[PDB]
Structures are given as structure tokens and as C-alpha cells.
Amino acid sequence: SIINPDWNFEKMGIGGLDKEFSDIFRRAFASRVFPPEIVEQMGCKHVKGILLYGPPGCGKTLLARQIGKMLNAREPKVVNGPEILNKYVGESEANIRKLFADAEEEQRRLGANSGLHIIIFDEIDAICKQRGSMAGSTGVHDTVVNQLLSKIDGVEQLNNILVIGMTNRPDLIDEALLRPGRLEVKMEIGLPDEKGRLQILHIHTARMRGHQLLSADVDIKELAVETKNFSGAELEGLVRAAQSTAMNRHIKASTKVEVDMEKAESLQVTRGDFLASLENDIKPAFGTNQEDYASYIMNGIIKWGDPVTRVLDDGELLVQQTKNSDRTPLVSVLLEGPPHSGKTALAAKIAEESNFPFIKICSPDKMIGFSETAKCQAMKKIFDDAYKSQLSCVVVDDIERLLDYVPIGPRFSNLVLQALLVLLKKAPPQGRKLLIIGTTSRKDVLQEMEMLNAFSTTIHVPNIATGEQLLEALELLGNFKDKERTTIAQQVKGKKVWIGIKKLLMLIEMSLQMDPEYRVRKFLALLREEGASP
Amino acid sequence: DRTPLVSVLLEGPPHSGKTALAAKIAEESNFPFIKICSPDKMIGFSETAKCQAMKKIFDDAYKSQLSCVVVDDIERLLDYVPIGPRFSNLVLQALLVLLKKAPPQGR
Ligand SMILES: Nc1ncnc2c1ncn2[C@@H]1O[C@H](COP(=O)(O)OP(=O)(O)OP(=O)(O)O)[C@@H](O)[C@H]1O
Ligand SMILES: Nc1ncnc2c1ncn2[C@@H]1O[C@H](COP(=O)(O)OP(=O)(O)OP(=O)(O)O)[C@@H](O)[C@H]1O
Ligand SMILES: Nc1ncnc2c1ncn2[C@@H]1O[C@H](COP(=O)(O)OP(=O)(O)O)[C@@H](O)[C@H]1O
């Protein structure tokens, strides 16, 4: 026995996680804490390894170092997954073998009283003959896994080893590395919560409080509630950025204003720095991105007709439905409308007003030149990442352009079709909601391919069809004069009006490119030219 | 004793609850070996991988004295789509050959 029965995990680095320690100890290392005498009387072996999986950058290695330290073991021998890889035949195996030289020597010499060695892999998935299943060529010369297995156990027995692995894609691990007698204990490290964020922020700001250099104005609870779905490293980055900005401001002010030395020595970080850097410096991967909205909602939304209100209200009802309910952890909805009816903007809007923590937009714009397998990889990655939050809402910007449709033929990529059809019907991990929004301009084709059946609801987005609607929209935009408006109203009473908002904006901009004399006539001529009759 | 291999097919209109009935009838058998092979676990695979997975499941199932193997949503496995038509031939042939193979004597 080298530790107290109740352990201790506080103000020694790791602060977020406290229950996982107790759980893992109760499950795994009960053998090494009990009076030895009965242990030798027991004839029972010790667990020969464990595996940890969780979202990247959530503080896993710290657990390994702490557990290695507390047990009174030797120095951990860190190693990197991809690093152990060579193109020369029969070379990586030597690397895998060398790691156990010290343990072998100690076991041979001291017999059954040697110390404890610990070996810490990193991205253990690097060496597996399972990644080759997916579309590609990464057979990684399976021999590696056989060598690793035959070294952990086999004809020669080692009783002085403990293997700890860290990975991010739990699925891609070969099954054989989980049978009893080998790595045989799993655990999950989920995202931190409010209390964990508070503890981590408090820990990393101890120096400033000790030296009083921090401004008294700043709190920690406010900032903690501000950060919704950050990760471990993000809090440290935020603190560093705040320090840098505060000091830059202080030095610039001192140079600009010859302040008395009293404030010059003072380097108070103040509170403005924290918020400024938070909104301008750090961009969490798992959090909301306020930036992307502007890239699609470029001109806001102006209420020009009743349908907008109906659509927004229905979106609100769907959001309410997905938030609080059971028996339906997954929901779907599809938007359809003629070309240039501004479907995308509505989707982005409704997603924004959803007010969910995790929101992401995946459009074909960031995938040009990709072969289909890459598209499957992207879809899978984004959905898998979205599965790691309590709530989530994803937006598939343009379903049609994803499939590579073209009326001639017809032609498309079947593989993407399957991937989407299967994915739209997979419940998240237990106790987690979701919301998926589509978009398209070709309803009939989707109806024909049986995919419309998978979606669970539909909404319609019509166009401008009435003259008075056009007058009201023009007035809202505010680009035409009173007598000019009268002329337009006089000439547009025919009611044969059917146009899309995007086209209307472009047409107005074009018509505003000559002298005031001829604007009305040119605009009317161009509008008359586009006499659509759906 | 003289019919070691049996088969059965469920079918109905969509949303009629077939998967649930299949799973329930499988559970109520009290056989020692059960295994469900669904399309949800092979997203984005290549057909060769699907064939290998099918072969592995059936090989493992052979070893025991009893068993009950369930294949769910045949059409999705084949990757059917009414336009065309288009689908995978390899999966179809593998499944069809498998579905009439006897295990080793007395199983
Ligand atoms: N109330 C509104 N309704 C629709 N669009 C609006 C509205 N107000 C402004 N817009 C502008 O309409 C455009 C909408 O872009 P969007 O991509 O949705 O159009 P689209 O051509 O119909 O779609 P897509 O090409 O993606 O199929 C943006 O410029 C947006 O600024
Ligand atoms: N008698 C019943 N038959 C079928 N499902 C039932 C029955 N009673 C309740 N259910 C519920 O129905 C749901 C089963 O629906 P399920 O998704 O299996 O339908 P399906 O038509 O077989 O699916 P799919 O065609 O999408 O593969 C479960 O919630 C189950 O609890
Ligand atoms: N629970 C935690 N408490 C304190 N710091 C943490 C915690 N989790 C992550 N960190 C921060 O993350 C950094 C190390 O991250 P690391 O352990 O390498 O992530 P991973 O284990 O996922 O690779 C440290 O600088 C540390 O400040």
C-alpha cells in the first residue's frame, strides 16, 4: 500500500475529472491496494492494461502521467503512433520490440520483485489492419499487430508491465486487442461541464491571484457560464490571449499617454481583454461559429409576405419539439422551392434562432474537386463529431448538388446516396437529441428516388406572385422615388408577376446603372422580358 | 434431423415494424448463439468489405451447436435504387450462395 484508501485529486493539475478516478480504481487496480499477504495467498494476477477514448484535446495524457506517478512506478516511456512506422520491410517490428528491453532485463535479473514499468502509446489506432476496410489502401502490413500481441503475452510471460493507450476513433481498433488477458478495460472521457470549466479556470489563474496582478473587476463564474462547449486547451489559450492583449494595450497606452509610473508598473489585465479575445481570438471546434452566418445571410431578412412568418413559426415548433420530448430523439425536415427562392438564408436563420450550443453547416462549396470517397469521409466525420454533444443541429446546404445530378443520362454517385439515406435514420448515443435540415430545388427527382420517404416533414417556400407584394418589397428596400414608385405601380398592375428574390435584387442593381432618366424604362423592359409562366 | 438448414422471410409495407418483430422472435428462441447483421455498422464501406464481414459472421456462427443469424433490410445491403436499376452484384452472389450451405454434420 502506497496511497490512502480515498485518494486525492485537487489542486494538482487535473481538476475537471474526479469521478473517473474513483471508478477506474474500483474497477481495475483493487489488487495493488490491498494488503499483499492475502494477495500472494490469493493466486490472482493483475490487469495488464487499459484503454481510454474521448474527444481530442480534452486532457487524457495528464491522467496517464498522474496514474503512473501515484503508483510509484518508473519513468513513463512516451511514444507516438505514426512515429512508429517505416517503409523498409521488417523495420517497425524492431521499434515495437525495443520498448520492452528494460522491462525484460529487470524481470530476468530481479525475478519477481522488480519494479513497475509503464508504456504510453498515443493514437494506438495507427497500427491496425482495420483502417484498410474503408475505401483506400492502408493495409499497414498487419505484421505489426501480431508482433505487439506476441510481446504483450505469448510463450514468454511478463508480470511487470502496464500498457496505457490513447486514441480518438474507438471504432477502428482491431477487436483482438480487447479479449480477456489483454487490454480489457475501457473508459470514456466526455466533454467538461460548467463546474469543470470553473475548476480549470480557477486552477490556471492561481499565479495572477497570488501576485494580485489580475484586475479585481474580473470574475470567473461569468466567464465560466460564457464558455458553452469549450475544451480543456481552449481555456488555457483564452487565458494566454487575454494576457497578451491586456499587456499590448497597456504598453500602447503608456507610449501614447505618458502615464505616471504607478500605472506603468501596474499591468492589470482588466475585464475588457477577456471578452475581446474570447469573441475575436479563440474559435472552439465544437462550439457555435457566429462568423459563418454573415457568409450566407448577406442582406438580412425583410418580411415581405405572409409565408415568411408561417415558415419561421413552423421552424420554432420543430425546435421546441426536438428540445423536450422522448420516443423521438431524431427529427428531420426538408425545404423545397423554385430556383432563387432564397432557401439557404431561411435555413441559416432558423438554425440561428434555434439557440443550440453546437451548430455546423456543410455545403459543397468547401469540397470542390473531391472524389466521392472523400465526400463520404466528410459526411461521416461531421456527423460523428456532432454526435458528441448534448444537443445539435446540422444543415445540409444543397442536397441536389451533393449527388452530382445532371438531367442528361441521368447520372450520379450512388455511394453518397446510400451514405445519406442510411445516416438519416441513426439515433444518436443514448440520451442525446438532434435536428437535421435539408434543402433542394428539385422535389420531383428526390420523390422518385425513394429518398423523400425517409424525411419526416415538408415545408413549401413560394415566390413573389402579386404586384402589391413587389411594391411593398421595393418600398422596404427603399431605392425608388415617389413618382417613380407611382410609375412602377401604374405599369405593374397587370399582375403577371412571378419572380425570385435573388433575381429581383440582381435586376434592381443592374437597373440602377444608368442615369436617373432611363432607370424606370430599362427596369420595366427587363422585368417584362422575364415573363415566367410556371 | 433431416433438415439441418431452415430459412424464413418477413415482408410488409414500409413503417410496418418488421425489424422489431424479427429481433423479438430471435430473442424468444433461447438459443445460445445470436448475432444481428445490419447495414448501419458499415457506412461507406467498399463492397469487398461487406462480403468479408458477411463471411466472418457466418463462419463464426458455424462453430456452435445451435444458432440464429438475422439479416436486416436486404435491399439496402444490395444498394438498390429504382432509377437504372443499379446495385452491387458481388453482395447478391455472396448472399445467394451462402443461403443454401449446410453446416458441418450435426449442427
Ligand atoms: N427575406 C428574404 N428571403 C430570401 N432571401 C433573402 C431575404 N432577404 C434577403 N435575402 C437574400 O437572398 C439571398 C438568399 O440566398 P440563397 O442561397 O438562399 O438563394 P437561392 O439562390 O434561392 O439558393 P441556392 O442557390 O442556394 O439554391 C441572399 O442574398 C439573402 O441576402
Ligand atoms: N406490434 C408491433 N410491431 C412492430 N413494432 C411495434 C409493435 N408494437 C410496438 N412497436 C414499436 O414499433 C417500433 C418498431 O419500428 P421499426 O423501425 O422496427 O419499423 P420497420 O417498419 O420494421 O422499419 P424499417 O422499415 O425502417 O426497417 C419500435 O418502437 C417498437 O417498439
Ligand atoms: N481536466 C483538466 N484540468 C486541467 N487542465 C487540462 C484538463 N484537461 C486538459 N487540460 C489542458 O490540456 C493540456 C494538455 O492536453 P492533453 O492532455 O495533451 O490532451 P489529450 O490528452 O486529449 O491529448 C494542458 O495544458 C492542460 O492545461
User: 3-state SS of A341-364?
Assistant: CCHHHHHHHHHHHHCCCCEEEECH
- Tell the residue nearest (CA) to atom 16 of ligand 2: B17
Experimental method: cryo-EM
Q: B102: phi > 0 → left, psi -120 to 50 → alpha, else beta; which?
A: beta
**Mutation test of the interface with chain A: which of B38, B43, B55, B75, choosing the one with the most A Cβ atoms within 10 A?**
B43
Helix (H, G, I), strand (E, B) or coil at A276: helix
Q: What's the rounded Cα separation, in Å, for the pair A175 and A129?
A: 10
Q: How do strand A332-336 and strand A117-120 relate by DSSP bridges?
A: unpaired
| A48, A129, A228, A502: the active-site residue | A502
Q: Is the CB of A302 under 6 A from ligand 1?
A: yes
User: Cell 465544437 sits at which residue?
Assistant: A286
Q: Which three cell numbers stand for residue A281?
A: 481570438
A116: CB partners within 8 A, 6+ apart = A71, A72, A73, A74, A160, A162
Task: Identify which of B14, B52, B79 has the shortest CB distance to residue A414.
Answer: B79
Buried b vs exposed e over A306-345: b needs ≥16 C-beta within 10 Å? Answer: eebeebbeebeebbeebeeeeeeebbbbbbbbbebbbbbb
Strands A458-460 and A332-336, how do they pair? parallel
Distance CA A44, CA A207 (A): 47
Nearest-5° Cα angle at A405, A402 to A410: 150
Which residues, 6 or more positions from B52, have their beta carbon under 8 angstroms from its beta carbon?
A: A133
- Nearest CA among A32, A65, A67, A61 for reference residue A47: A32
- The phi, psi pair for A119, rounded to 5°, reads -120, 130
Angle, CA of A301, A341 and A449, to the nearest 5° = 130
Distance CA A351, CA A31 (A): 52
CA distance A495 to A464: 11
A375 is catalytic: no
What's the rounded Cα separation, in Å, for the pair A125 and A130? 9
Query: 3-class DSSP state for residue A189?
Result: coil
Are A201 and A223 contacting, i.e. CB atoms less than 8 angstroms apart?
yes
Q: Apex CA A176: angle with CA A175 and CA A181, to 5°?
A: 125
C-alpha cell at A146: 501480431
* Residue linked to cell 432563387: A340
Which cell goes with B67? 444458432
Resolution in units of Å: 4.0
The Cβ of residue A54 has, within 10 Å, a number of other Cβ atoms equal to 19
Nearest CA distance, B73 vs chain A (angstrom): 11
Q: Is residue A462 reached through a cis peptide bond, with omega within 30 degrees of 0 on the bond before it?
A: no
Report which DSSP code applies to A220. Answer: S
The number of the ligand nearest the C-alpha atom of A425 reads 2
Q: What is the DSSP letter of A119?
A: E
Terminal CA-to-CA distance of chain B, rounded, Å?
10
Cβ–ligand 3 distance for A55 under 6 Å, the answer: no
- Indicate left, alpha or beta for A221 from its phi (over 0: left) and psi (-120 to 50: alpha): alpha
d(CA B59, CA B47): 18
Q: How would you classify the pairing of strands A393-396 and A436-437?
A: parallel
Annotated catalytic residue within A61, A344, A373, A487: A344
Residues with their C more than 2.5 Å from the N of the next written residue in chain A, i.e. before a break, are none
Which DSSP state fits A405? -
A74 C-alpha vs ligand 3 centroid, how far in Å?
22
What span, in angstroms and rounded, lies between the C-alpha atoms of A200 and A220? 10
Question: Which one, of A71, A24, A9, lies nearest residue A189 by Cα?
Answer: A24
Measured CB to CB, residues of chain B less than 8 Å from chain A are 14, 39-40, 43-46, 49, 52, 76, 79, 81-83, 86
What is each CA distance from A312 to A50, A319, A460, B81, B96, in whole angstroms? 50, 11, 12, 34, 51
Contact A51, A186 (CB under 8 A): yes
B91 close to B47: Cβ distance less than 8 angstroms: yes
Phi-psi region of A167 (alpha: psi -120 to 50; beta: other; left: phi over 0): beta
Asked if A410 and B83 come within 8 Å (Cβ–Cβ), the reply is: yes
Q: Beta strand A117-120 with A161-167: parallel, antiparallel or unpaired? A: parallel
- Cα(A387)–Cα(B41) distance, integer angstroms: 15
CA-based radius of gyration for chain A: 31
A245-252: list long-range contacts, CB under 8 Å, 24+ apart.
A245/A273, A245/A276, A245/A277, A245/A281, A246/A270, A246/A273, A249/A273
Residue list for the binding site of A: 299-304, 339-346
Q: Pull the grid cell for residue B82.
A: 429504382
- Among residues A175, A82, A73, which one has the least CA distance to residue A118? A73
How far is A230 from A227, CA to CA, in rounded Å?
A: 6
Rg (CA), chain B: 15
Whether A89 and A95 have beta carbons less than 8 Å apart is answered as: no
Cell of A5: 484508501
A301/A321 Cα distance (integer angstroms): 24
How many other β-carbons are positioned within 10 Å of the β-carbon of residue A106?
17
The question of whether A365 is a catalytic residue gets the answer: no
- H or E element: which one contains A164? strand A161-167
**Cβ atoms within 10 Å of A526's Cβ, excluding its own:** 13
Q: Is the CB of A506 under 6 A from ligand 1?
A: no
Cβ(A471)–Cβ(A488) below 8 Å: yes
Does A397 participate in catalysis according to the annotation?
Answer: yes
Cβ neighbour number for residue A273 with a 10 Å cutoff: 23
Record: contact B44-A419, CB cut-off 8 A: yes
Three cell numbers written together for A149 = 500481441
Q: Residues A245, A397, A433, A439: which is the catalytic one?
A: A397
Q: Is A344 a catalytic residue?
A: yes
Measure Cα distances from A44 to A32, A38, A157, A160, A340 in Å.
11, 10, 15, 14, 72
**Residue A301 in contact with ligand 1 by CB distance below 6 A:** yes
Nearest CA among A78, A69, A68 for reference residue A122:
A78
Q: Which three cell numbers stand for residue A375?
A: 465526400
